[PDB]
Each structure stands twice: as structure tokens, then as C-alpha cells.
């Protein structure tokens, strides 16, 4: 019913800064308390701010002290978050929340939230891939079969394709989605399940690609 | 100040889903509860304990009874498998449990397998080692990783992926241990542990094969 939009979201290096700012619609700005909120993919919420309309009581979670600071202009109907040294760790989407509660009766809640801005703080450029060979072993996935595969490890951006013996085995391949880690960088593994009996006849090469970095590994995969 | 919640809770169609989350003198705080759908922002389901919004589906309720907050769901469908996060005010600082993942049942549960691969001697000789847990053919989508140093837990260094889709429709993921050549050769083993509706599966690897 009512909306928050933020912006100010992008690509920063570590040790970087960036401002973000939220503006209201439908509701007075000046009349709520406003709140910072943050998710890191894939995990949870954490509260990061909060600052009265009156701007005179003001807390930060731990993570963001000394770093942050929130601040709010009433005749502008906007909320910033300045952010400086910027690290990894800070990599998150952004929410502007409102809390519409009473105050006296310390009965909160976050109603509406933004849409969200995304915070990339990263120094990654292209680099192609190091291929490591993992190899085979019968205990995990056997009855007559052995698991083998390649890592294919830091590499950005995406896509990396692999395929095996040139496409030629295809059956039994399971290539898992790549991570995105802390360091910016991607990796991924792509595994082949094959008879054991095989495995002193048979050569095994993933055929990895990274055309973003132009490289090409192909990597044999030996019996230990 | 913590709020704890289960990582996953699942539920058959039409049947009644409870979440709870638990926190000291939590029967002192109002609680509040959040949905969020994959991409898409929070939005406020239950707050002041048991108010509900307008417009949030009656099936919807909220208690605060002997110190947990539970949101519960009767008659549950589809479009409630969600993230669901409690929160409560502590002391000007605002907290959120960790989030339940509701899935909503459509095929019998499937374990996962878990595969341990150790670090290739030639990454050893490249100064590196990687850990590679890969976990698939799990459904629910919603799996707890934790690797070990021996029987300790690990500090740092794990990377493990969000689950995502197989063709089958179940689950996929992956985590990565990244140590030193010397963290690698002075434990006797690393383990990934993987928890999956209440049952663990541990994977562990040596560096004296």
C-alpha cells in the first residue's frame, strides 16, 4: 500500500565507499522511525541501522560500527546510509525498512520494505580457472562404479562449460552449480560416475572452458 | 541477544505447519514474523505476537506462550513454502532468528548422497588445498553443512552453494573447504558433515590416504 524505493546499490572494491539513500511514498516520512536491513545471497537478515524521524536516537548493529553512518533529510523524504571501508563481508542486498510502531510501548515491526539494493564489494576481474583432478573413489557412489571428476577453481566471471572425453561420456555426469566465495571468484566441480573395472583402461579428460578469460584446460584424470 | 528457529520445517498439503522460535524472556517481547519468497522482499505476516496484517490469509496465527514465538499455518498450500524469520527487540538492537525454510511437500522426502573428495596432490604441490563435499538427490532443498578438523569444528574457509533444482526435481549442492598445504598434512582427517531432516550423513578424508 505504501512503498520504499533505495538506490544507490553497485560494484565497490574493498576499502571503497558508497551511499546509499531510500525515499517514501504514500506514507510521511517525517512521521516514522526508518531502519537499514541487509541479506547476504543465500542467508539470512540482519538488522544494520535505525535512526528516529527526529534524528536524535540512533543505533547500529556491531558488524557496522564505526564504518556506517544513517542519516535522514525529512524535507527530501529520504534516508541514506553512508558506508565506508567497505569489506567482502559487507556484500549484501540493502533493504530501507519502516518501522511504524509505538515507540512508548517498544512494540516494533518492519512494515513496508523496499524493494532492495544490491551492494557488490569485490575487486575480482577475469581470471581463467585452475582444473585439479579428484580422483576416483567407490565409496560413496559405487556398486561396481567409481566417482571422478575435476575441480575447476577461481575463476570469474561465469560461464565455465565442461564436458568429458570431448562429449563422448555423457551418462553419469553430474556438473554441480559454481560458488560464488568470499574472495569475488566462482569455482565449480563436475563429477562422472564410471565403471571401476574401467578405470586401468579407460583415460578420463574433463574439457573445461572459459571463454571469458579465453582458456582451455583439458585435464586427465588418473587413478591415485 | 539470539532468537533461535529450526532451519527447515516441511509439511504434506492441508496440513498444519508450526514454527517456532525460541529466545530468553521472549514472553516479554512482542514477536514479529516475516515471509520472503525466493527473490523478493520481506513482508510482515504476524507482529505484536498474534496481529495480522490486512490482507495476509487467515490461515495465518501467531502465539507467545512459555517463551517461544510460534507462527503457525493451518491448511497449508503451495504458495506458502517460503523463508519465514521471527524477530524481537532487544535493548534498541533489532533481531532476527536464523530463518526456517517451510517447504510444502509435493514427493516423498529423498536423503542425499554425499561424496568427500580430498585435496589433489597437485594442488598440495601448487601451495593450495580444497575440500570438495558434493551433495545431491536431496529433497527437501534445505541441508546443513559442517566440516571438522579432526573432531573440531571449522573456523574459516568454507564456501558452500544455496541448493538448486536437479532435473528430477530434487536437490543439489556443494561446499568447499579451502586450507593450507599445512593445515591439510597436520590433522589427521577432515570431515563434511551433512544434516538433512534430523539425520547426518559424515563424509571423511585423510591425508595419509
Known amino acids: 500500500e505504501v512503498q520504499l524505493q533505495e538506490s544507490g546499490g553497485g560494484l565497490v572494491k574493498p576499502g571503497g565507499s558508497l551511499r546509499l539513500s531510500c525515499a517514501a511514498s504514500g506514507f510521511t516520512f517525517s512521521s516514522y522511525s526508518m531502519n537499514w536491513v541487509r541479506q547476504a545471497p543465500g542467508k539470512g537478515l540482519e538488522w544494520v541501522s535505525s535512526?528516529?524521524?527526529?534524528?536524535?536516537?540512533?543505533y547500529y548493529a556491531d558488524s557496522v560500527k564505526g564504518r556506517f553512518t544513517i542519516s535522514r533529510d525529512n524535507a527530501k523524504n529520504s534516508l541514506y546510509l553512508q558506508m565506508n571501508s567497505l569489506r567482502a563481508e559487507d556484500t549484501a542486498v540493502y533493504y530501507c525498512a519502516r518501522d511504524p510502531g509505538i515507540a512508548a510501548a517498544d512494540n516494533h515491526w518492519f512494515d513496508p520494505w523496499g524493494q532492495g539494493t544490491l551492494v557488490t564489494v569485490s575487486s575480482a576481474s577475469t581470471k581463467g580457472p585452475s582444473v585439479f583432478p579428484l580422483a576416483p573413489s567407490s565409496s560413496s557412489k559405487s556398486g561396481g562404479t567409481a566417482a571422478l571428476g575435476c575441480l575447476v577453481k577461481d575463476y570469474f566471471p561465469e560461464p565455465v562449460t565442461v564436458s568429458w572425453n570431448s562429449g563422448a561420456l555423457t551418462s553419469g555426469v553430474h556438473t554441480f552449480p559454481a560458488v560464488l566465495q568470499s574472495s569475488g571468484l566462482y569455482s565449480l566441480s563436475s563429477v562422472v560416475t564410471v565403471p571401476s573395472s574401467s578405470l586401468g583402461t579407460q583415460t578420463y579428460i574433463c574439457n573445461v572452458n572459459h571463454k571469458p578469460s579465453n582458456t582451455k584446460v583439458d585435464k586427465r584424470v588418473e587413478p591415485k | 541477544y539470539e532468537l533461535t528457529q529450526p532451519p527447515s520445517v516441511s509439511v504434506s498439503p492441508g496440513q498444519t505447519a508450526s514454527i517456532t522460535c525460541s529466545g530468553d524472556k521472549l514472553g516479554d517481547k512482542y514477536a514479529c514474523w516475516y515471509q520472503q519468497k525466493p527473490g523478493q522482499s520481506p513482508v510482515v505476516v504476524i507482529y505484536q505476537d498474534t496481529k495480522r496484517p490486512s490482507g495476509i490469509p487467515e490461515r495465518f496465527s501467531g502465539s507467545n506462550s512459555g517463551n517461544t514465538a510460534t507462527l503457525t499455518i493451518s491448511g497449508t498450500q503451495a504458495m506458502d513454502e517460503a523463508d519465514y524469520y521471527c524477530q524481537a527487540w532487544d535493548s534498541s538492537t533489532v533481531v532476527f532468528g536464523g530463518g526456517t525454510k517451510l517447504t510444502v511437500l509435493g514427493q516423498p522426502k529423498a536423503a542425499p548422497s554425499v561424496t568427500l573428495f580430498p585435496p589433489s596432490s597437485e594442488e598440495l604441490q601448487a601451495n593450495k588445498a580444497t575440500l570438495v563435499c558434493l551433495i545431491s538427490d536431496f529433497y527437501p532443498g534445505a541441508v546443513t553443512v559442517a566440516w571438522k578438523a579432526d573432531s573440531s569444528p571449522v573456523k574459516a574457509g568454507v564456501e558452500t552453494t544455496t541448493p538448486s533444482k536437479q532435473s528430477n526435481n530434487k536437490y543439489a549442492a556443494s561446499s568447499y573447504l579451502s586450507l593450507t598445504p599445512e593445515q591439510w598434512k597436520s590433522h589427521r582427517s577432515y570431515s563434511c558433515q551433512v544434516t538433512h531432516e534430523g539425520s547426518t550423513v559424515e563424509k571423511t578424508v585423510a591425508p595419509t590416504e
Open positions: 535512526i528516529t524521524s527526529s534524528s536524535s536516537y540512533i
